[model samples]
Target: PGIYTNFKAAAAERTKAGERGTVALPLAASWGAAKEFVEINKEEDVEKKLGLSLAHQSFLLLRETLKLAKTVLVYRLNDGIKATATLATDVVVTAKYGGIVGNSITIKVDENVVDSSKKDVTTYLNEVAVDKQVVGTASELIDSNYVSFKTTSTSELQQSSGTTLVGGTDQPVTNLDYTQFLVSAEGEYFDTIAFPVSSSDVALKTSFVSFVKRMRDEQGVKIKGVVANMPADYEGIINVRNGVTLRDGTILEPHQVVAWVAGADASASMLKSNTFVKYDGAIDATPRLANDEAEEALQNGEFVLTFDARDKAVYVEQDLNSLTTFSKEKSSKFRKNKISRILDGINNDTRRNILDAIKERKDANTDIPADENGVQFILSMQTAYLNELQDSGAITNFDSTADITVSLNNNVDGFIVNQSIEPVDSGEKFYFTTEVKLEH
Candidate 1:
């Protein structure tokens, strides 16, 4: 059915694909935040690309991501332009990006102070005005052109006026932006992509879900996209709940929770229910969801979070998703981290090798016995790989000899392989028994 030159040439043509271990996120900043996907490997790379420090919210998530994965692909949904907050006497402060961070900046200029030989205009602003502010940073709040001294006054300076930043907007990210991101990221491999939108709008939610569906079904990719919601009967999307609060009293959205979940899944160890969120900026309050509320969320296929008294932090109550539909013939269940990990591993491994093997053998026009031997070789390779997974405590009691079967299809043009395994679940419940055997 296929033609090729030398069989040995086919062996040399095999290309080993790169490892799958990338996480994609959207950044909120003033510059380069609205561009296409930007690959970040370290903290310095964030500043190098976006001109924003790691203190920003998007960069904060990037820091958390680097803790688990080696690389993070960032997309800036909001443009770096915004309206300027004007001050008295022609002085104005413009926000780097149109977002909530602009509201946090407070500008104060002392009228009595003036630029001297020792202190220039920029230095005076940095040392005298910005240093005393409650929030804004001198290096990041405004550009150099906005800082100037009064021409007539050598000792006297402009009058005092304190203005808080405003007018920053986060232009709603559209389906076009998502599509552009996918097009820009074509041919790139990412294990997980996180959607940071906290909107409850049906259009936005549907767009996110549709993109994930297209990526997996149409593109023949095995990647997963994480979002916030209670989506039922969906395996490609992970719906997270929003209840955790930050130290600043801002309630965290489901999108932020998705960032944490993606990072945990990317870690070297299997994500467990007891895994701490390690959110340094979170408050010490108890979970917002009460017993009844939690039960309802779980029943709705939502991932919930709870406060852990021992850990003194917020922790995931369960490692699950909104997948209620189950099928034995296909790999579709993604409620648990174990299920996703096994599926991703097997899919990536088998797809890469099988494609290469097929290219090498198709030219030979091999008989049934030769093709059968090739299929058996692939099965043996998977068995050894699964054995390694068993040793790592990912899967339990996987018997390579008994749980694995590889045989040629009598009526079809291929082979049939079946494998069974048991995933090790996290400890979520405990029971104790006592017998009445008194010492009397």
Candidate 2:
């Protein structure tokens, strides 16, 4: 058994932060909003009424993750499309929508033309007064009717990037603008299923889903993540700034790590692959590969296929299955699952190198006879296992075939490109509740 190949192969060594999973809400809040969390869904709801960046960090966290819920409530707020610092504490403001458009709104306060005691707080959407409020003191500031005004203490809010502000009352943020000290997110052990740079292998994603299904259905473990985050008062709002590096020393973006953290952190394998007892050991793989097919995979760098007599079922685990290889010599720790996991790492990175190779080949020229028809990729798992001793312990007989799919995207590049693009932001979870306004 061997893999078909003319492709570069490298393994992925994922980092498991801990045996437990937790979503770290990494907020890169510098200008507009920081130190808070308000649980309202969709950009239209909280961020719209409050400030769009309210959910900005969360959006970035899950955007690269979550194929979880199978139907997970993946509520993403917006891209770097800041909701314009509408959050003016002295005059709490929120840029109505997202995009570069909202940044045009400038909040300017000038000495009232009519009275010296009165300050004319003019909210200009541009050179125009989309809203104008005349207030005697900062306490009297009211909604321009265009945007809401939560009267808190701050000098006053100033316009960002381009603007003229003569007021010392820079109302950038207020402690009371949002609900109390918002900082913690918990209770996510549920499959409310939810990366850094991705491997981009089509099967890698399928494999993730398969792993989730196996953990949830077969292994009977409860976990969600792989795609996931939260806030705190101050120390609360800050935790997920970063942390995750591959065995190969690749640091994962917090944006991309939630998924892996959730996937690997929560999954405490029935059998331990990392810890060696006198050497270390866990449950048998469901034997997705068995007999005839497994024989090929074993030869091709897959996994082992084991059968038990008393259990009346087929399985594969350490120390449990008899080391009989049909008529061949016996096996050892050579084909152990620990080795299989090591190969899983390789499978993911192989795609990355393959793309690099494709890029080089493509730039070389398109007129080559090799490019005339199309480049065909025949990937085989020859090195899935490299332990020489296990070469002789051949698998005997059983009833299963592994799964695989072939891909050839529209353009040669589309096969590698257009895969994770043109994103549509939608609310994964929400609640439309009745409002209790101060005036109402």
Top candidate by TM-score: 1
Any runs in candidate 2 off by more than 4 Å, and if so which? 1-25, 30-33, 45-105, 109-120, 124-132, 136-139, 142-183, 186-440
TM-scores for all predictions = 0.61, 0.25
* Candidate 2: RMSD to truth: 20.7
- Writing each residue's lDDT as its tens digit, candidate 2 over 1-440 gives 11222221122113222332223222222222333332322334433333334335534443222211111222222223333333333455554333343455677666777987776667665467667777776667665433445556564544333232221112332322211111122222232232122333444333434444454334333222232122111100111222333333444444354443332322323223422211001122222444566554434322132334455332222211111232222123323333322222223233443444445455775321222233333222212211111121111111112222223343432222111100011111111111111110
List all candidate RMSDs to the true structure: 14.8, 20.7
> Please, what is the whole-model Cα lDDT of each candidate in the order they appear?
0.55, 0.32
Quote model 1's TM-score: 0.61
Q: What does candidate 2 score on TM? A: 0.25
